[model samples]
Target: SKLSVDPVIPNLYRKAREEGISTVFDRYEAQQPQCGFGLTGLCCRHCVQGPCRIDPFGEGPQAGICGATAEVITARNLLRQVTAGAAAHVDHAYDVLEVLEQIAQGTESYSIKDQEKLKQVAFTLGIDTANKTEQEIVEEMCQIIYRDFANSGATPMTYLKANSPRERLETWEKLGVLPRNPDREIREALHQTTMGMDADPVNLILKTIRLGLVDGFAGLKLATDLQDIIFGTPQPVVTEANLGVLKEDYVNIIVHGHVPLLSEKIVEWSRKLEDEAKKAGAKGINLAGICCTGNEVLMRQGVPLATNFLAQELAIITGAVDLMVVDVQCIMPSLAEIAACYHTRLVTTMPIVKIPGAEHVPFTTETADEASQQIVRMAIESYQKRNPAKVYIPREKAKVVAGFSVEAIVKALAKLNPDDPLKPLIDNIVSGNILGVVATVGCNNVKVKHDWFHIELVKELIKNNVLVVTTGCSAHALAKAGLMDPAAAEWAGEGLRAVLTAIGTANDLGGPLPPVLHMGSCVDNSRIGDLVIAVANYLKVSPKDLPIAASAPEYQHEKALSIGTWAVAMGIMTHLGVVPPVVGSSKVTRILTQDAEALIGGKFYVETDPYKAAAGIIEHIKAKRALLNL
Candidate 1:
């Protein structure tokens, strides 16, 4: 299989082989040819009418039977992809919200960890937190948020999280596109994109933006606020990355996918079940994660990550994995098929999301502990099921620093100040000397080579002293390449390297790296939105004035668009590589470029060249800095 010998993959595969673990290299290697269309964004199976394929070369313009041009199909497909991507994150937020409700009602085991953040969130939602206890404020805010969601048109307050007063008002007056309910926007998008639905490409595309806003503002905002209140906002935390992070001496339970309802509880159970492992004759239980769930656990609990979405089958191949527990989104059904070849127990938890032939473990916030304990026991039992003769574990792993929140970044920046001891680091951000914040996020494509864009672009930005915050695959790439460590400071431009040196912070700041802060899973892009607000609050400016920008130079997922839209709506200059379907229409494209900035806080630009993208981002920050007279 190509994956077994593919130069980019062997570093991971050889480790698994050395560890006596078998892997999914053969399975993925067989699928490598399919990866070509995957990178080009040319494959589609949206409708039974036709599983469309846009020819990369030969074409009189790729078109579907419904007269859908290449750009329209691309836009629709991309929007739907982002819709799913946004849905994944927003859905996770909803789960967290449910748990918060449970906590508020005294039905859940979790407690509010950050009272101040709770009050602040309540205040943001227009709930009166004054004179109210932390619990009271949380309960009240939850109700307010829930009620706002229930009413379902566009909440002025929700837009406040993602848009400025001017931009929000303009959008309200012109497009009437305020997200009334979380599900409302998503449903509308689906309805519009359906075969016999609104076939007008323009309208479909517009709704796509609105749907993304629901993620960036309503759903994501709620998740970020609630998670901060419940678990305390994530700060810089140190953890290891890749398959090598797994342990052979313990029952290795790899929690995969996005939903935190299961993984968060698993974290709690793993801590409490140390005795259970001791009783079982194992050293202890090892809880690691892959994909977004990995990001969530890594940020909050400092658990090691096995890999991201693409690494799932690879992780199981190591054969050291006793059980791989999954919730929803990004869980490959291939794992169940592959698990059949090994002793690894594949556990599926969510009812809405199911994989055939995998063990079902119905878990809810209410049964979190019990389910977690049961899963751990199941994992421990699977250890006995391990076919050691066929076992393999990847010795190749990378050191990673995870968990960086916006507030944490501000605090870290404040510590860099040689003079001001009282004013927060956010003040400097508004002042513009620090320039803007850049989120260099998304995945590495096999087409562009592993980590090429993510590594080079991040290095370019940080060298120019742009503060970068990363999540998902980009974080993994940076960490694996040793770019996340502060000691790699010499690689950064004088401005950024000096900031690291002045703070005397290490690359892995005990928990997560700060300069390029890792927020969490792909969906945790919402955390970036929250960070934007926090920076705005501290700087006494609108989110637009923070001189911030977002880029997905090596993005291969629809979620990148959803994330990019939310950032743009919040007034951050956003750059994306691999142009969306909208590019064919100059009129539509112009709105995103020249016009939307007037209506929203920021505009979106697509750059194919990696260097140009970085330069454009730096240029945007400089322009914002000049605008703020910082």
Candidate 2:
């Protein structure tokens, strides 16, 4: 019952318990009394010579077999984690890039849906969009982006160079941490952290910052731009969330994972295959999303959010979901086991992610429709197998107002003053109507009570008048909690509520904007970065000088770490609710939590308690505002 604060989760968890289906909550307890060495980042398995550990109690070896101190080993381990995260986002971006190339080459499955976004991106990359066709611009942009993947020159990444704020670029250039190519930097990080390579913790930390930059520009920003160009950039959309979104008499298809490629097609096929599902004795097709893919299609396609990372198993336990399709990241292997307990069909679509007990349907850009058609058909057929005795759909859900892309926000503000759209927001911030901004991002970790930290931390921030922007599972948590509902403005501080009301009224929303704005998936953290840059540029101040901060209260992914590092690099104070594994080395921990601020103008702040973290973040925001004399 204490597993999650999610209203529906506790009910579904009871069902799982009664049915003898083990969930992540069970597995988390089983792994209790976890290795203290690994928890402290004091363990090393970098080589076959030894699996050495540095005892934190000072009763055993103080260094590894190769004399690597806790500082070196910890920093090395952290860098590897950050690198892996960068690789995941970068690889995702590369996948989108290939799709863009195929579109330019006249691919059938996907086309440039947002030519305006394409032109905007082309202009940013210095391409002559004025005289070029959309295809020409896309082809030229693809070539430039492809260079960012493989260029050997010492020149910085074109995407990074063009998109990052000038001051940030200068700082990175001065520090010599500017990444030349995303792939090269990721590869070099792997090589640099090997058994005998770089040994200086300080140097390793610098490379960590560099990789963070790579992730920010090459990974997050690049992927978002191409995605917006391919699929239309997200605009405000209304939806619902929670397991209750599943339907009892419909073929409920849940799209799970990070990428939108497959889910986009799934949404289309669900609509097109409505007749097929009706013929199968169902009302129609019901589509719900889990994790970033949920955020992706939720913002863009208005798909209801089913659940987040920790409660994925619980979604299947509803026994109402006909088929759960996954591509990559945050997918629980336990899902197959849980699904097997019901008539639920588990389908794996990505070539890289296949489970032992799930069906595989290959999804390619060229065959996207074919795959989605087949997957939806499979769900319709599976609907016939649903055991009415086992089905349980929780009747808990919340209204959500999401899809606030940078462009969407601008358009909303533009209604008040076409010539100076940001003026109103800047005036509100300056007047303390909105104290500052807080971006709560990242995942749901089983180590913490699911969704509790994200919900409590964000509630505190909004109560303090901090305008919250959210992405990833944090968005899922907030939406499911009603934080993304227009009425949620009532929970905000008086000042923030007023500002939200003004903006909402101005936009004809009939009520205040939600205290927290959903900005899209994990990769769409780039949208948050873009919004910050626009605000900073308008105020003629560096991002570090702004009254803004970011937090990932329930983060459990390496991608969260890399994104946090990128946030720090962008000069935003980033808060982590979980204490990372750097405590074994006072030097490394100090550098990350304190010293790095002076060196890069931003640093990590760790606090396990969500309310305390909220207080600390609000305090930090106040300090920045005071510095700005606001």
Candidate 3:
């Protein structure tokens, strides 16, 4: 069964099958019985001399030609995967930094929309934001952020040092896993993992933790802060999600990528070019999102969500999407081929990401408007070519109250107690009105039922009074499942429901906040981190002692691994529903799942069952609570 918990997906998958068009589900099935060696992290291809595979059955070579043991190979391979993940996030962060630099130089394409956020970040960095222009403050912030990319000294990343909890920073320093410069650390990781380099599994594992820090600080934290400053911190926004959000009579353009630079422009130009879409025989321009780009716009622009990572191709299968333009990560390469089956125009924006069948629109900060205008115009032309007979939008959509940034949550709480915003939340936690917090993050893997793990795990968590915060495709899954609606509070435990309802009533929302808070994109996981630090500081406790955990139930990307590692490094227990490739080495697995907890107060919990994973996380929260004498 190509099953998905998402109600809208089955019909579209069936449609794709009927049309002989392959989706990710079909491709996943075709590649059945995937390589065991690679699955277990036993395959090594670092050197051109040989591609070695260690036999798990003990019937063949126990080590590679370089004499790398199972643990060595597994640890090395894992670090390499994490390094690539860090590279992607750091690169994404650098792109935004470049944009910020341009803004500092006075660019009309973007501006410092969140002046307060800019000042807040500048203050965090120890920059004197007092009596300074926005450009001057931005220039100072840019210099500090760029130092994390180019610094040649032994200083830890400025962003990480500033944003992370002091206790966590001390822990990292004691462990010698503190990352120096983002670029240097990434470069050193590559050099350390090359053929015949560092073979000590333990040391490699430590370096892996260092890269995680790089990703957490120089990548995730930096990007989120700069984005909030540019796009403005997200506040409460009511929206709708699912395939039904696509209007049949409207010109639909689905933005599917991680970066907001291009998607933000698309949203702007879509409104600016609404008349063009109307001239092409459409009712209006409908902008919906698919992946994090969808989350980016949905938070800031209230754009409807079309789908998430797994069902991106299915969005095109509806034949209602006139054009689907992508920017970067989490995009399916199969989308172009599937779009060829319909009148959908698949456009690739960004030089690093281009598909053969899709038209390319080069996007840069300088030409953002021109590129966005051209893409929207292309969608308008494509709308006239949409085939009405093939269109089939399933009537399954859910009300979503998203855009809960860290500031938004704090501001909402301030309504309860203006003097001390976190007091009410802390009181709730102490009184067991809220059990703990769990952040569900990452992408969807075809190996698991689409949205199944994310939905089930979150349901169990909220049912147990564990407050959930979500980002990335996980956010999409929960939002589509109605967990992002204030009415979802009905599913929560009585204590949590009361707290949510009270907060909602205090904010004059007439209902509870959603059981699962939608915190922006994957990079916005930094918002979760910021919240954790705030709570930890208020109580004068280490973040590790807080009753908080993170889960990426249906995660598929290397970025998820790095994020999980970062979560662990930050002294938060992290759960992964899908087992990673490191299970072949018992020692390596134990180090991640058990030993690391003793070393850093956090570890990875591998449980494929959603209910079981939820129970385990709740149990961990209880253990932390017990330690706190709550």
Candidate 4:
């Protein structure tokens, strides 16, 4: 019953037993009766003084050994988690900026894949190409972006100021939490969170918002922008999803984890190595995806996605993945031992992330050619070792249309109305033909049934006339469930389906736009911000005024929490199907769920049931629509 979505999943859950491999699911089962202190965010090991945990129920140890209250410890813990999440994305963004700098200097093998995008971003930053080469403009663009990371400005980040709605910017400014430099905000958060420093719960929460701004603009948006320049912007593409994408006879390679820089090169070189797979007794090399790394290739190269976060071990368990190459983030270390049970060779590429049992190829942007080739070759060789009896790729996948970059979306809308492209979409929302847009985002958590919340939440929203947009592992789940197919438009309410069909036919797609627009990886939540910005600008209202909401239905990662924090900072009502650890303190919980609505015009809505979550979101949309007189 747990694997009823696909036959192969249950088959392999049993198959994995024969080889004696433990997946995230098995581990989650073993971790039952988990620590309540950790679950409630009452635990803190911030200093060497003690592994401090306050009594969440307020009966025992009212404070830690250092006398830290539950509120302080909880706030500090959340701030640290948010800071780490922001730091990870900022590191990825920082990496891309370095490559862009190298490319600008004409020192790297990388070339500008989208000059128009390069020009647009440069122009926004006041860089002109007049009497200068494109290289000069890129250099200037890199300088502008570099400062956003390198320099700690007194004002908010330049990118955030230029991109965010003026009213929202002013609100954040007054709150005194606008991000300056990503690095500066992150350092300050970490420092403040450290023991014997910031003990004020309110101040810590304020810094948390600042850290989110760093993640939202300096990290996620910056990463998405630079990446679109390096690799061409995504467009509408046809693809398949789920384990069915894996092939039995072909050398199946799954790119797991996030960060597209290395994965892009892997896609390029995998084509040349296709012949090697043929020589190794396979038809050819089959490249599919897993997690956001999968989202990157799926959006750009039309690569099919084999699985999401929860089902990763199942992919290896399918006994079809010849090689699973991971870069960074959302990669479970258990993948190493799971691969040992099958013919799958899990290769860790990022120097920062290496599993004890997994082989390390150590990928860098400069040596992308050599490293990618070696990685592909390893996959080809591993294919020969794949047992024919063990290989069982499910014949269950959904044909889906993905790749809806902000630019791609505009281009499509322009097809519907050349003069005022966004007008059609805006008018539809205003006219109540399309109620609103809901971004179904974030990851798969073993804490809950895999993909169930994402699938059901989206289905409920679509049937209620809400346009759904998605990214990250949630994209994989929805894609596998057939929501990304145009035929699924029939599932939408009458009015929404009519608008979708009209726009689809105008764009020459012959049907409706897929119920969910795949907006790349988690970092590409920037695209969602871009869409919201464009809409807010058109309506001359703050993003808070719009009937927009986002949901991370089954999230476990700190990155998801940080991203949700950023969404809250953006004045959007965000829903989390899994209650976060802040439930330990009523003050923190109230600030997040209730009191925050007045301060930021956004707050968290926590509900375990997917149906109730959808209904609550729909009600919020209706209330906002009433305010706008729609």
Query: What TM-score do all the candidates reach, one by one?
Result: 0.85, 0.99, 0.99, 0.98
Q: Model 3 segments beyond 4 Å from truth?
A: none
The models' CA-based lDDT, in order, is 0.69, 0.91, 0.91, 0.87
Q: Which lDDT tens digits does candidate 1 get at residues 1-630? A: 333211235655665556554454444456767644434555556678876666655364466666665556655665676677667666777788878887778875788878777776676667777776766876776676666557644455453443344434465446655566766667767656665455555566566667777777665666667777888777767677667777777888988877666788888887787887777777888888877777778888888877665456677766788888988875667788777767788999988978888999998767778888899888878887777765566566555666777666556655655364325345445554356678877764443545566777887887887778888777776766666665556666665555456554532233323356687766667777766765666556777777788877666666677877777777777787655655544545776777777766678888877788888888888888887776
TM-score of 3: 0.99
TM-score, model 1 to reference = 0.85
Candidate 3 Cα lDDT to native: 0.91
lDDT at 569, model 2: 95
- Which candidate comes out best when scored by lDDT? 2
State residue 584's C-alpha deviation in candidate 4, in Å: 1.0
Better of 1 and 2 by lDDT: 2
State each model's C-alpha RMSD to the native: 4.3, 0.9, 0.9, 1.4
lDDT of 4 by residue, 346-465 (tens): 999877898999999988767889999999999888888888887766789998899999999988999888999898899999888889999988998877788889988998898998
Error of 3 at 57 (Å): 3.4
